[PDB]
């Protein structure tokens, strides 16, 4: 047993770890910056986690061990003047104007100011922002005017994807961050997952507006504006509000929507039991089929694009089904004014993603029916926040609304397409019961539910066993097949988000300060909002919901042929 002083308070513990980590979990206050993903910016430590070792001088608290006999300052004036100036110098190359700012209210990097009361040596004021900024892609910008050149994106990038899309790069004898040879990142092998923005602590990272788009369909008067959630914002939105981790605001978000003036309040869940419709259709046709196999989930962009740009040979087995996303957009567009009456043109279908990826994804080109796209616009979780809060709209004490039901309602199977095994989970509820001609009660598949990189299990369908797999996280894809496991076995069907925790821990998702997330853990959490509304919803199996039955007796047929066939399915070449 070590015993260490620290700021004249004496310790005794069992524990290999870092100052920085027992000073946090024995509410010790050091400041961190550049350290994240249990990582900091090797190249370059912003020394902002500074402390004193009697007998060594000012160490890094974040990769510095604790020892016996240690003796530690963390507030004395040389750790804070030289810790004050490093943000000064971080100051020099950043725009410090935070009233227009899209992190004004939760900046990493503005708290540490204000904490030591860091100052410019001379205020960075540049006069042209477009050569600081790349708003190229369809999913992703930069805004290199914010940069703390901290590393916190490049390793995110390598650890949860491993493709290392953002690299640090020498642009005319100086250091940025980008893509590869400071092409527009679409252009790259990069998925456009946008976790490089979630670990960001500034605003030098951003999703692609598209509220411009959302504005002006608003305002036009011939516009009939659609609007519809993702699962995973109502377990999110709330934190961007004050309300803390895990509180379910569905019925905030209706109500919410209405006041900003959209024409009517549908769900994406909804296009999750379309998506199921469709999917368990075919992975009962590819059994009787005897393949081909194994047939991968279609509904992540970002897998697709690591399909695309990896794995080219699988783009074939990918499942023909249209995502949650695309698969109501085009419902949107057809059946929609079919009870309606609205002509299809003026029709105009906005979604709130949890996911930089998805506005790629809309923008595909042939993503269009008879000149009219399936999804006209997709904001974030982060922008929907912004757009009521811009409306004054006092979201925390809303009353509860319910969705317009025509295209609103949803099974609890697609209210848990948000978390990693949700799909996988909520397409063996309706393949079962269709392979077997039955109705079975025993629908809950916790095998392939939780945070594991790589789940696996066993199913029973009619009468023969099969193998599926749940890839959680993009990293985790490579892991599966560079090692072989893709070969332990003959696997039938894999669900793969590029996203570790699934949609839940999306690259549009609010973003949470890391000693929050130390704190809670932010996947389980917000997935546990998705896994209570399908326990307590009346209806559990996708091809049960109600008003989906409808529009496919009345609209579409059977799924996976004729009508749905024709429109509700996408494959990539
Ligand atoms: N489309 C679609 Fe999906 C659905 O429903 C979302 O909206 Fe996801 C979420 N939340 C996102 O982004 S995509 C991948 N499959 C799981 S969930
Ligand atoms: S990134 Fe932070 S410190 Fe910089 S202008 Fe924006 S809110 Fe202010
Ligand atoms: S873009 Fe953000 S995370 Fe990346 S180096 Fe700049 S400040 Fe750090
Ligand atoms: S969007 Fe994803 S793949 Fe692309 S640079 Fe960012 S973290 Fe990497
Ligand atoms: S897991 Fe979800 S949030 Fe992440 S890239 Fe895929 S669809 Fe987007
Ligand atoms: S937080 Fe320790 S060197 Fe950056």
Do not use: W
């Given at each position: 047993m070590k015993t260490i002083i620290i700021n004249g308070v004496q310790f005794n513990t069992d524990e290999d770890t870092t100052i920085l980590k027992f000073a946090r979990d024995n509410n010790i206050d050091i400041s961190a910056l550049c350290f994240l993903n249990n990582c900091?910016?090797?190249?370059?430590?912003?020394?902002?986690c500074t402390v004193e070792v009697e007998g060594?001088?000012?160490?890094?608290?974040?990769?510095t061990l604790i020892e016996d006999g240690m003796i530690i300052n963390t507030n004395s004036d040389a750790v804070n003047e030289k810790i004050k100036s490093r943000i000064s110098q971080l100051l020099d190359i950043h725009?410090?104007?935070?009233?227009?700012?899209?992190?004004?209210?939760?900046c990493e990097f503005l708290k540490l100011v204000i904490k030591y009361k860091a100052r410019a040596?001379?205020?960075?004021?540049?006069?042209?922002?477009t050569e600081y900024?790349?708003?190229?892609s369809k999913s992703l910008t930069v805004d290199?005017?914010?940069?703390?050149?901290?590393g916190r994106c490049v390793n995110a990038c390598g650890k949860n994807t491993?493709?290392?899309?953002?690299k640090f790069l020498n642009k005319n004898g100086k250091t940025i961050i980008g893509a590869e040879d400071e092409?527009?990142?679409?252009?790259?092998?990069?998925?456009?997952?946008?976790q490089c923005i979630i670990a960001c602590?500034?605003?030098?990272l951003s999703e692609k507006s598209h509220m411009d788009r959302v504005k002006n369909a608003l305002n036009a008067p011939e516009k009939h504006v659609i609007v519809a959630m993702a699962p995973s914002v109502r377990a999110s939105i709330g934190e961007l509000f004050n309300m803390?981790?895990?509180?379910?605001?569905t019925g905030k978000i209706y109500t919410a929507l209405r006041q900003l003036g959209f024409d009517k309040i549908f769900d994406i869940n909804f296009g999750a039991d379309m998506t199921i419709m469709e999917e368990a259709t075919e992975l009962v046709q590819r059994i009787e089929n005897n393949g081909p196999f194994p047939m991968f989930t279609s509904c992540c962009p970002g897998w697709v694009r690591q399909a695309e740009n990896y794995?080219?040979?699988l783009l074939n087995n990918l499942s023909s089904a249209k995502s949650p996303q695309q698969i109501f957009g085009t419902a949107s567009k057809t059946y929609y004014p079919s009870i309606s009456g609205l002509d299809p043109k003026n029709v105009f279908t906005v979604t709130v993603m949890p996911c930089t990826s998805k506005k790629f994804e809309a923008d595909?080109?042939?993503?269009?029916?008879d000149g009219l796209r399936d999804i006209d616009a997709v904001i974030t979780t982060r922008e929907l926040a912004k757009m009521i809060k811009d409306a004054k709209?006092?979201?925390?004490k809303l009353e509860d609304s319910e969705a317009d039901p025509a295209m609103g309602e949803y099974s609890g199977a697609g209210a848990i397409?948000?978390?990693?095994?949700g799909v996988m989970e909520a397409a063996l509820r309706s393949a079962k019961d269709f392979a077997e001609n039955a109705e079975l009660?025993?629908?809950?598949?916790?095998?392939?539910?939780?945070?594991?990189?790589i789940k696996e299990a066993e199913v029973e369908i009619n009468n023969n066993k099969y193998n599926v797999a749940v890839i959680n996280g993009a990293s985790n894809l490579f892991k599966f097949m560079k090692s072989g496991m893709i070969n332990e076995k003959q696997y039938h069907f894999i669900e793969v988000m590029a996203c570790h925790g699934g949609?839940?821990?999306?690259?549009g998702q609010p973003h949470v300060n890391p000693k929050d997330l130390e704190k809670v853990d932010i996947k389980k959490v917000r997935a546990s909002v998705l896994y209570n509304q399908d326990e307590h919803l009346?209806?559990?199996?996708?091809?049960?919901n109600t008003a989906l039955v409808k529009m496919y007796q009345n609209y579409?047929?059977?799924?996976?042929?004729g009508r749905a066939h024709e429109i509700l399915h996408f494959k990539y070449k």
């Open positions: 900091n910016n090797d190249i370059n430590k912003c020394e902002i060594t001088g000012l160490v890094t608290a974040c990769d725009e410090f104007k935070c009233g227009p700012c899209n992190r004004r209210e939760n040596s001379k205020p960075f004021l540049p006069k042209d922002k900024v790349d708003e190229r290199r005017t914010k940069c703390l050149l901290c491993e493709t290392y899309a953002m092409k527009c990142f679409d252009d790259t092998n990069c998925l456009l997952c946008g602590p500034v605003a030098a803390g981790f895990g509180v379910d605001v794995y080219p040979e595909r080109p042939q993503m269009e029916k709209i006092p979201f925390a397409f948000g978390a990693t095994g009660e025993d629908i809950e598949y916790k095998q392939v539910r939780g945070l594991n990189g949609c839940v821990n999306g690259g009346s209806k559990r199996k996708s091809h049960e579409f047929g059977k799924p996976g042929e």
